């Protein structure tokens, strides 16, 4: 229970599954140029209005 | 969104709970709106109502995380009478982690989010105490 | 990687269009020639940090 | 500053947000790109004529020439895409997702 | 230290220009000559450490680890030349090059005068070990074990890099000799708490600490025998060496930062010995025994009394020899029955009596039979932890009971009882195998005669 | 080696390393002061060369 | 393509880069970027298949948008400064727009969304040019405008690039996409240290170009575009598996290799300026890069994947490829850490 | 950092004040390590083309060794020049600013009170 | 030499010993200058340690 299950679960397995899930969220793009430039517009709007990088 | 962080961090811990909870809610809601905007950007919803449903779900999820975080941290600083103490933000971060687990309708996500968001909120409180800079200005 | 080839070789590839106070065709003055000349002759040689 | 600079910069941002939000046609994207160039042309020209900065009068011409050669390059890309897929739709350019 | 670095590098043309039937004999001979030459490092003094250059020095802590490291290479070549007999000649020379290169990294890891050089060599020792495990390991799990071995160590050590460069910017130097005189007290703050964690968690992973030990019973099991020897004998002791250097700087904050890790190791020496009571894999039993022994070294460094450091360095050397011999005995049975299952080959004293004598002596050194340096290190750690708190004698004694239990359970299970009937490829013990066992055990017994050269800088 | 040799060699080592450490701390302090004040030979980000300025009498006098 | 026309077009790519690197006028900077894109478009369309036309179209749209935002930043600079010297920018809006334009030209996140698509769509030599030579000119402009670069913007772009280039390569089996997400993470590492010490930025760029040139040259010499095609290299040329092993171990940042040099110097110059959290999170995030590098080493060098029968015919033929500077680049990408204080030649 | 120093005289690999500095000896361990890198490049070049590694192309191995030593000698000259420039600027800035570098009143350990923390 | 490979590691040790004894000459800034071991030189002796 400790040293095949829980000490394996808390540090390495949960971190591996979290990086797996974030890897699947990054690279699940549909290859659509419309969506990438629409995200670029949302980026520039957040940088101006929300993050004040032009100030 | 820098003014959201200023109107959060100006208040001492365990003094004015409604404005702490509302400011943390507004920070979390701004974060949820940013996540919602990139989510409806890169992943096209099938309808306009689907898009506003995803936006409302993510924004209310992160705003409820911020609400229960700020509430639990300020109430713990009231009832424990130690304002300069990162254990209050550890408790608030676990409350926000259980909030994220209750919104995702799963227990193990809630336990992982409790642990890591509580450690992250404790680290943010220690950075407020010792003056840790993440975007440190170039000096040498 | 500002490889200053122009100052190395002595060629003037683009220093002529760089400022308004430079040599102009038929000696035409810019409308802010004196102000730019004063700011450049102030800030010359002391670096950006002292110049600001 | 001057009142016309507001409209020329707002024209640049209007053609920007047009270029950053595709509908279907790559040609409309290239039209928004050259509208961005047009607004940049007008804005540079109004500055350089207002300042009486003599030598930079050749600057907007060099801008126009380089960006119209760029536009010719983009039209040739659109032509090769249209000879591949029959149309110029940006949703046909999705082979590189995998 | 250059008179040891240069012959270790000259072992590379010695292993690549050798005749194809001579590449084991030449490397064994000249690594034995380097191991003979290693004894010149015993020029130690009661006040000053043997300080060679701006880059290299050797006190009485690094010197026994150096002699054990330079002694381990011929024994790894003897252990690993039978199961790599049918290997390609080029891949055989690559294996010998990885062993020689790991020794080359270790002998200037322990002698690093400056701490970022220690860090570069310390994390350089991952790469030949990783190549050995993931290339010449036997089963499927060697790739996953190489992943765990790499990504626990780097996860622990990349905060250590930021900590050491911070000390470089604050003190002005990471020379250990200068930091013996420019050490400042480290007070209580959260900044210094994470300073302590960044300086200590890499070495806690390398010891290993209980709870972070999960790289070890896969890396030590899925390695070949030379990998298992170097991992059990030197690469766990890199962590204790780094702790004994870096806890110079962490005072007085260690006096209350040590409590969770002292609890983890005092309870991990009970739990991993209990795990050893119920192992089916013999090689995993030796792996969890290594965790159980290094828990005491962690407690002895964290309580930082002189008796604790003396017992910890004695126990590090003793455990290096003992665990290397236990893995070699496990390999000597694995090369006959082709299984690491401990219950499979039974009754082996009826078949291999002198090899069973080597099993008996390694199980007696594992249970810390006096006057072995196993018992010397064990006993000094128990003295210092008793002076720390009088209630730690319960945990130390209960650990010693379970340690004797799994040591003699290993002995009785593999060697005693009726032999397994359906196993008939039990060859007699080769001269290579018995010579390997004796070259482990005989220095470990001769060090009981004159044990002062393995008791560290403060004997 | 002798205790004399090891001792005096250790003293030479400690001198060289203490001097390098003092020079590193001074190097950090010099970098901090030269980035803050901007009056050293470092961090001299360029301004416009005043040799480019035309000093001839122009077409109109008011300049 | 005609070899004369190929040589002239590569000289025009290099000419646009040099015009950005030497010129003191903003119009000539913009001209250099225009010439560079205009000349590199045929290199991407060298093979004339629809993936190259798609990749060239996506590259055109991104670099064209960045060139127009660059000219808008230049025009706002001409408003608020009346001049054209390539130095600091005299308005935070011009600085923001120029930092966005250079972030789009480098393909740093969140403008990164073209780099794996365009790198997958084009051959390995043109992908090498895109991921090594096309990083030179925008880093030169960022090297020159750094008294006006907003710190929070450039560090946001940097850490977002490192994180997204870490998570992006974990899902990949195509080698060109692995190299592209490696590019995004390393550009984050370069721009994170820029306002602190840009000499370490140039050190990271040089070590990165050496290692990426080594990996693309090994991938060209073995003609492998996927993980599983690289897996047959042990049965074809076993020295190539050794070289890709040591180069992938270098690019992961392991000592004693020279890919540890840039990140160690970046952490070294960011802790001087009292930033501890940020280089620590950057270093921990680079373990993802090391993870998919070790995935490739497992598939290539440390294990032997199954081959096919037709490899026996390829045993009978040597490589007649011009593996240009491959031993030199392999030595420089691995054995350069004892020469770490050589970085002062970039001061 | 030092980019305004080498901006009055641009693109000089070794300036005229670099000649006031002693050159690296040809038995420099750094330069010998670069020659070892040339020998390693020769060995990899014989290996990737499946030539005999130690024997084939001794002219080619020797040109690898020679070319790396030839480049690395000037690289070491520029390295020593730039660190000499760094120390020269450091010392002149300390000399021009005595108010920013006060000579520290050093106390001996008979006056220095350090808090003793017992290990027990 | 028929057995020329058996003098790689021993000549390597001789060369490393030579380089250590050479580096001891470069670290000689306190030879006969330490407050513990400074002394007047014996005749027919120019250095106290080599
Ligand atoms: C103060 C305001 C400002 C703060 C800073 C800005 C705010 C953003 C935070 C930082 C950036 C994080 C990421 C942002 C993008 C969101 C991810 C996304 O696109 O998701 C879609 C998509 C996910 O959908 P999917 O793939 O279909 O899978 C999801 C499942 O289907 C089903 O999934 P699901 O239904 O379960 O939910 C999915 C979604 C829903 O997420 C949630 O519901 C959680 C939302 C946040 C919860 C935590 C709130 C914490 C509140 C803190 C306490 C408040 C008080 C504080 C007091 C002071 C401190 C003590 O979760 C995710 O997408 C997870 C991955 C991303 C994690 C984002 C973490 C945000 C941290 C915010 C902390 C505050 O992911 C992608 O497409 C990933 C690729 C994106 C690449 C580009 C990203 C660029 C982002 C740039 C951001 C910054 C702007 C840059 C400008 C400057 C440079 C030019
Ligand atoms: C972030 C906090 C965690 C929240 C996300 C959880 C994972 C995603 C998820 O919900 O997936 C479900 C869902 C679909 O996934 P799935 O199909 O359920 O996959 C799960 C499997 O089926 C397997 O089924 P399952 O659901 O039963 O198992 C999932 C497992 C649940 O685990 C268990 O049930 C067993 C283990 C119990 C929980 C873990 C205990 C760990 C205890 C601490 C470790 C030792 C601490 C020692 C401390 C000593 C000193 C005091 O949870 C995880 O694997 C998560 C591990 C932690 C995530 C973050 C790791 C970051 C590492 C970076 C370096 C440090 O994904 C989404 O919808 C994506 C979006 C999710 C919502 C937004 C994400 C949160 C963003 C908030 C802002 C964060 C900002 C950064 C803060 C931290 C860095 C400064
Ligand atoms: C200064 C920076 C120099 C940068 C590199 C310049 C050369 C490469 C660029 C052009 C190119 O690819 O040429 C082919 C290239 C060979 O590269 P490859 O395609 O891999 O050929 C490999 C085989 O060795 C080809 O063998 P092969 O059978 O075809 O013929 C043998 C060939 C025949 O040789 C000749 O034909 C040479 C005689 C005619 C020369 C041209 C006259 C016009 O000799 C060699 O290739 C011997 C190796 C030469 C050395 C290659 C690397 C040079 C050093 C690079 C810098 C290293 C710096 C390390 C710094 C470390 C610390 C940071 O160079 C030559 O053939 C001549 C190299 C001359 C080196 C001079 C160094 C000092 C310059 C001042
Ligand atoms: C030196 C190091 C670099 C050597 C590169 C070439 C090695 C080679 O080709 O060896 C074969 C060659 C003998 O082979 P051969 O009979 O001609 O034919 C080759 C067979 O066909 C081979 O059979 P095969 O190819 O048909 O199949 C077997 C397969 C076997 O391969 C496999 O099965 C795949 C791999 C298996 C798993 C991985 C094992 C580890 C291998 C990589 C090493 C990684 C760790 C390196 C360090 C850690 C950091 C990553 O492949 C090989 O064995 C290929 C040959 C290469 C083996 C050795 C690899 C060396 C390169 C990697 C290490 C050095 C560079 C990185 C250094 C990093 C920083 C320390 O070996 C030698 O001759 C060794 C050199 C001995 C003489 C040294 C003399 C030194 C003199 C110094 C003084 C004079 C110069 C003064 C200069 C200064 C003047 C001022
Ligand atoms: C709360 C309000 C949120 C409103 C934004 C989300 C609405 C949405 O996603 O609508 C769907 C739309 C795509 O249009 P749709 O009609 O689905 O296309 C099929 C053709 N009939 O999707 C889009 O147009 C995607 C882009 C929507 C704008 C994103 C940025 C603003 C919204 C987030 C911040 C507020
Ligand atoms: C692993 C991840 C570990 C993260 C550790 C973060 C540690 C805290 C760093 C930021 C912080 O809170 O710094 C404290 C600082 C308040 O102090 P000061 O620096 O004086 O700021 C006012 C100056 N205008 O506050 C600030 O500088 C601004 C407030 C920062 C708050 C960051 C989190 C906000 C909520 C999530 C978005
Ligand atoms: C806040 C950020 C946006 C700021 C400007 C908002 C303008 C109003 C448009 C809101 C979004 C409407 C929308 O869904 O746009 C998507 C559309 C492309 O979609 P389409 O293919 O036409 O139809 C399928 C439906 N997704 O895309 C378009 O129609 C693009 C048109 C862009 C032209 C902008 C004109 C000026 C806008 C105000 C100044 C900026
Ligand atoms: C299982 C996996 C394997 C094992 C991995 C390693 C596990 C142990 C690692 C962490 C050890 C515990 C943390 C350090 C304990 C030593 C004393 C201490 O700091 O106690 C926590 C603190 C007690 O309060 P106090 O110390 O008085 O606060 C003033 C501090 N200047 O408490 C508080 O102030 C309240 C809580 C603060 C936040 C604690 C969590 C973050 C810090 C640790 C990481």
UniProtKB/Swiss-Prot annotation, chain A:
Coiled coil: none annotated. The chain crosses the membrane at residues 31-51. Signal peptide: none annotated. It is found in: Mitochondrion inner membrane. Core subunit of respiratory chain NADH dehydrogenase (Complex I) which is composed of 45 different subunits. Core subunit of the mitochondrial membrane respiratory chain NADH dehydrogenase (Complex I) which catalyzes electron transfer from NADH through the respiratory chain, using ubiquinone as an electron acceptor. Essential for the catalytic activity and assembly of complex I. Belongs to the complex I subunit 5 family. This is NADH-ubiquinone oxidoreductase chain 5. It comes from Ovis aries. The chain holds residues 552 to 606 of 606 of the full protein.
Curated annotation (Swiss-Prot), chain D:
GO terms for molecular function: NADH dehydrogenase (ubiquinone) activity. It catalyses: a ubiquinone + NADH + 5 H(+)(in) = a ubiquinol + NAD(+) + 4 H(+)(out). The keyword Transmembrane helix applies. Gene3D superfamilies: 1.10.287.3510. Pfam families: Oxidored_q2. The chain crosses the membrane at residues 1-21, 29-49, 61-81. Its EC number is 7.1.1.2. It comes from the Eukaryota. It is a multi-pass membrane protein. It is found in: Mitochondrion inner membrane. GO terms for biological process: ATP synthesis coupled electron transport. GO terms for cellular component: mitochondrial inner membrane; respiratory chain complex I. Keywords: Electron transport, Membrane, Mitochondrion, Mitochondrion inner membrane, NAD, Respiratory chain, Translocase, Transmembrane, Transmembrane helix, Transport, Ubiquinone. Belongs to the complex I subunit 4L family. Core subunit of respiratory chain NADH dehydrogenase (Complex I) which is composed of 45 different subunits. Core subunit of the mitochondrial membrane respiratory chain NADH dehydrogenase (Complex I) which catalyzes electron transfer from NADH through the respiratory chain, using ubiquinone as an electron acceptor. Part of the enzyme membrane arm which is embedded in the lipid bilayer and involved in proton translocation. PANTHER family: NADH-UBIQUINONE OXIDOREDUCTASE CHAIN 4L, NADH-UBIQUINONE OXIDOREDUCTASE SUBUNIT ND4L. This is NADH-ubiquinone oxidoreductase chain 4L.
Curated annotation (Swiss-Prot), chain E:
InterPro entries: NADH4_N (IPR000260), NADH_Q_OxRdtase_chainM/4 (IPR010227), NADH_UbQ_OxRdtase (IPR003918), ND/Mrp_TM (IPR001750). GO terms for biological process: electron transport coupled proton transport; mitochondrial electron transport, NADH to ubiquinone; mitochondrial respiratory chain complex I assembly. The gene is MT-ND4. The chain crosses the membrane at residues 22-42, 60-80, 98-118, 147-167, 196-216, 224-244, 256-276, 284-303, 308-330, 351-371, 391-411. It catalyses: a ubiquinone + NADH + 5 H(+)(in) = a ubiquinol + NAD(+) + 4 H(+)(out). It is found in: Mitochondrion inner membrane. It holds the Pfam family Oxidored_q5_N. It is an enzyme of class 7 (translocase). Its main location: mitochondrion. This is NADH-ubiquinone oxidoreductase chain 4. It is a multi-pass membrane protein.
From Swiss-Prot, chain G:
Core subunit of respiratory chain NADH dehydrogenase (Complex I) which is composed of 45 different subunits. Interacts with TMEM242. This is NADH-ubiquinone oxidoreductase chain 2. One of its GO terms (biological process) is reactive oxygen species metabolic process. It comes from Ovis aries (Sheep). One of its GO terms (molecular function) is NADH dehydrogenase (ubiquinone) activity. The lineage of its organism: Eukaryota, Metazoa, Chordata, Craniata, Vertebrata. It is found in: Mitochondrion inner membrane. Its EC number is 7.1.1.2. The chain crosses the membrane at residues 3-23, 25-45, 67-87, 96-116, 122-142, 145-165, 178-198, 200-220, 237-257, 274-294, 325-345. One of its GO terms (cellular component) is mitochondrial inner membrane. Its main location: mitochondrion.
């Amino acid at each position: 229970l400790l040293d095949l299950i829980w000490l394996e679960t808390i540090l390495p397995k949960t971190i591996s599954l979290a990086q797996m899930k974030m890897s699947t969220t990054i690279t699940s793009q549909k290859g659509l140029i419309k969506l990438y430039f629409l995200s670029f517009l949302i980026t520039i709007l957040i940088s101006t209005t929300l993050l004040n990088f032009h100030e | 969104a820098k003014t959201l962080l200023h109107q959060y961090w100006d208040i001492p811990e365990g003094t004015e709970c409604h404005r702490k909870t509302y400011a943390a809610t507004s920070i979390g809601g701004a974060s949820g709106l940013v996540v919602s905007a990139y989510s409806v950007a890169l992943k096209t919803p099938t309808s306009f109502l689907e898009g506003v449903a995803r936006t409302g779900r993510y924004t209310f999820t992160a705003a409820a995380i911020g609400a229960i975080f700020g509430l639990t941290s300020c109430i713990s600083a009231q009832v424990r009478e130690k304002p300069d103490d990162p254990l209050n933000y550890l408790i608030g971060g676990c409350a926000g982690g259980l909030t994220l687990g209750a919104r995702t309708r799963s227990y193990g996500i809630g336990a992982a989010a409790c642990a890591y968001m509580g450690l992250t909120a404790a680290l943010v409180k220690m950075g407020q105490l010792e003056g840790w800079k993440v975007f440190a200005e170039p000096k040498v | 990687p500002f490889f200053d080839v122009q100052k190395k070789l002595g060629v003037d590839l683009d220093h002529w269009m760089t400022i308004q106070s430079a040599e102009q065709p038929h000696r035409i003055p810019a409308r802010c020639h004196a102000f730019e000349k004063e700011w450049i002759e102030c800030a010359h040689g002391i670096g950006s940090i002292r110049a600001e | 500053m001057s009142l016309v600079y507001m409209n020329i910069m707002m024209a640049f941002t209007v053609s920007l947000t047009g270029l950053l939000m595709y509908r279907s046609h790559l040609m409309s994207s290239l039209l928004c790109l050259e509208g961005m160039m047009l607004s940049l042309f007008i804005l540079a020209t109004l500055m350089i004529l207002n300042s009486h900065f003599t030598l930079a009068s050749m600057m907007p011409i060099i801008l126009l020439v380089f960006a119209a050669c760029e536009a010719a390059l983009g039209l040739s890309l659109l032509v090769m895409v249209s000879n591949t897929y029959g149309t110029d739709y940006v949703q046909n350019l999705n082979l590189l997702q995998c | 230290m250059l008179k040891y670095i240069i012959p270790t590098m000259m072992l590379m043309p010695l292993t690549w220009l050798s005749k194809n039937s001579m590449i084991w004999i030449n490397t064994t001979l000249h690594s034995l000559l380097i191991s003979l030459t290693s004894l010149l490092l015993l020029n130690q003094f009661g006040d000053n450490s043997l300080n060679f250059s701006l880059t290299f020095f050797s006190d009485s802590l690094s010197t026994p680890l150096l002699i054990l490291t330079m002694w381990l290479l011929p024994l790894m070549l003897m252990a690993s030349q039978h199961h790599l007999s049918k290997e390609n000649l080029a891949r055989k020379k690559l294996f010998i090059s990885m062993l020689i290169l790991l020794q080359l990294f270790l002998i200037m890891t322990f002698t690093a005068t400056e701490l970022i050089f220690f860090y570069i060599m310390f994390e350089a020792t991952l790469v030949p070990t990783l190549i050995i495990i993931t290339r010449w390991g036997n089963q499927t799990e060697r790739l996953n074990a190489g992943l765990y071995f790499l990504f626990y160590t780097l996860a622990g050590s990349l905060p250590l890099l930021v900590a050491l460069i911070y000390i470089q910017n604050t003190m002005g130097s990471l020379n250990f000799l200068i930091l013996q005189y420019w050490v400042q007290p480290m007070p209580n703050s959260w900044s210094n708490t994470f300073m302590w964690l960044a300086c200590m968690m890499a070495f806690m992973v390398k010891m290993p600490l209980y709870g972070l030990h999960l790289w070890l019973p896969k890396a030590h099991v899925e390695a070949p025998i030379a990998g298992s020897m170097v991992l059990a004998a030197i690469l766990l002791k890199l962590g204790g060496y780094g702790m004994m250097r870096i806890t110079l700087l962490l005072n007085p904050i260690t006096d209350f930062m040590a409590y969770p890790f002292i609890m983890l190791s005092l309870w991990g020496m009970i739990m991993t010995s209990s795990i050893c009571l119920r192992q089916t894999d013999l090689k995993s039993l030796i792996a969890y025994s290594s965790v159980s022994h290094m828990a005491l070294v962690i407690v002895a460094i964290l309580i930082q009394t002189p008796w604790s450091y003396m017992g910890a360095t004695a126990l590090m050397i003793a455990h290096g020899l003992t665990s290397s011999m236990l893995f070699c005995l496990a390999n000597s049975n694995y090369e006959r029955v082709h299984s690491r299952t401990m219950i499979l080959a039974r009754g082996l004293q009826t078949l291999l009596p002198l090899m069973a004598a080597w099993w008996l002596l390694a199980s007696l050194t594992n249970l810390a039979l006096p006057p072995s340096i196993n018992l010397i290190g064990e006993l000094f750690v128990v003295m210092s932890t008793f002076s720390w708190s009088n209630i730690t004698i319960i945990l130390m004694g209960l650990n010693m009971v379970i340690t004797a239990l799994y040591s003699l359970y290993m002995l009785i299970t593999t060697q005693r009882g009726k032999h397994t009937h359906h196993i008939n490829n039990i060859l007699p013990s080769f001269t290579r195998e018995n010579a390997l066992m004796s070259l482990h055990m005989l220095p470990l017994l001769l060090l009981s005669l004159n044990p002062k050269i393995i008791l560290g800088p403060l004997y | 080696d002798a205790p004399e040799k090891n001792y005096e060699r250790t003293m030479a080592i400690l001198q060289i390393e203490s001097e390098k450490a003092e020079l590193r701390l001074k190097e950090l302090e010099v970098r901090r002061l030269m980035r803050a004040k901007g009056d050293g030979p470092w961090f001299q980000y360029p301004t416009i060369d005043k040799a480019l300025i035309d000093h001839s009498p122009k077409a109109t006098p008011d300049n | 393509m005609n070899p004369i026309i190929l040589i002239i077009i590569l000289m025009t790519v290099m000419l646009g880069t040099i015009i950005v690197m030497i010129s003191t006028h903003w119009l000539l900077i913009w001209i250099g970027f225009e010439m560079n894109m205009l000349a590199i478009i045929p290199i991407m369309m060298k093979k004339h298949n629809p993936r190259a036309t798609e990749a060239s179209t996506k590259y055109f749209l991104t670099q064209s948008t960045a060139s127009m935002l660059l000219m808008m930043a230049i025009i706002i600079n001409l408003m608020f400064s009346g001049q054209w010297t390539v130095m600091k920018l005299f308005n935070p809006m011009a600085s923001m727009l120029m930092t966005m334009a250079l972030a789009m030209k480098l393909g740093m996140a969140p403008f990164h969304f073209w780099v794996p698509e365009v790198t997958q769509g084009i051959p390995l030599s043109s992908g090498l040019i895109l991921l090594t030579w096309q990083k030179l000119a925008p880093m030169s402009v960022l090297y020159q405008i750094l008294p006006s670069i907003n710190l929070d913007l450039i560090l946001t772009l940097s850490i977002l690039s490192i994180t997204i280039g870490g998570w992006g390569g974990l899902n990949q089996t195509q080698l060109r996409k692995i190299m592209a997400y490696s590019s995004i993470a390393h550009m984050g590492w370069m721009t994170a240290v820029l306002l602190y010490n840009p000499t370490m930025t140039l050190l990271n760029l040089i070590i990165y170009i050496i290692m990426t040139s080594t990996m693309f040259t090994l991938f060209m010499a073995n003609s492998t575009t996927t993980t599983l095609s690289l897996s047959h290299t042990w049965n074809k040329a076993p020295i190539m598996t050794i070289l890709v092993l040591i180069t992938l171990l270098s690019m992961g940042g392991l000592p004693p290799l020279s890919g540890f040099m840039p990140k160690w110097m970046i952490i070294q110059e960011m802790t001087k300026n009292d930033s501890i959290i940020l280089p620590t999170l950057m270093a921990i995030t680079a373990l993802l890069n090391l993870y998919f590098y070790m995935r490739l080493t497992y598939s290539t060098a440390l294990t032997m994947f199954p081959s096919t029968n037709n490899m026996k015919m390829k045993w009978q033929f040597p490589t007649t490829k011009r593996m240009t500077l491959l031993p030199t680049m392999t030595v420089l990408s691995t054995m350069l850490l004892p020469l770490t204080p050589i970085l002062s030649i970039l001061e | 950092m030092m980019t305004g120093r080498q901006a009055r005289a641009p693109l000089q690999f070794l300036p005229d004040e670099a000649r006031s500095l002693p050159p690296p000896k040809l038995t420099d361990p750094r330069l010998a390590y670069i020659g070892f890198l040339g020998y390693c490049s020769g060995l990899i070049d014989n290996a990737i083309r499946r030539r005999p590694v130690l024997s084939a192309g001794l002219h080619r191995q020797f040109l690898y060794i020679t070319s790396f030593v030839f480049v690395g000698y000037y690289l070491l000259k520029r390295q020593d020049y730039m660190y000499a420039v760094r120390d020269h600027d450091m010392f002149s800035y300390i000399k021009s600013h005595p108010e920013d570098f006060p000579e520290k009143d050093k106390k001996t350990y008979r006056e220095v009170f350090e808090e003793f923390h017992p290990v027990r | 030499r028929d057995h020329w490979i058996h003098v790689l590691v021993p000549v390597g040790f001789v060369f490393g010993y030579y380089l250590d004894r050479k580096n001891d000459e470069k670290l000689a800034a306190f030879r006969n200058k330490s407050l513990l071991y400074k002394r007047e030189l014996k005749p027919q002796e120019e250095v106290t340690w080599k």
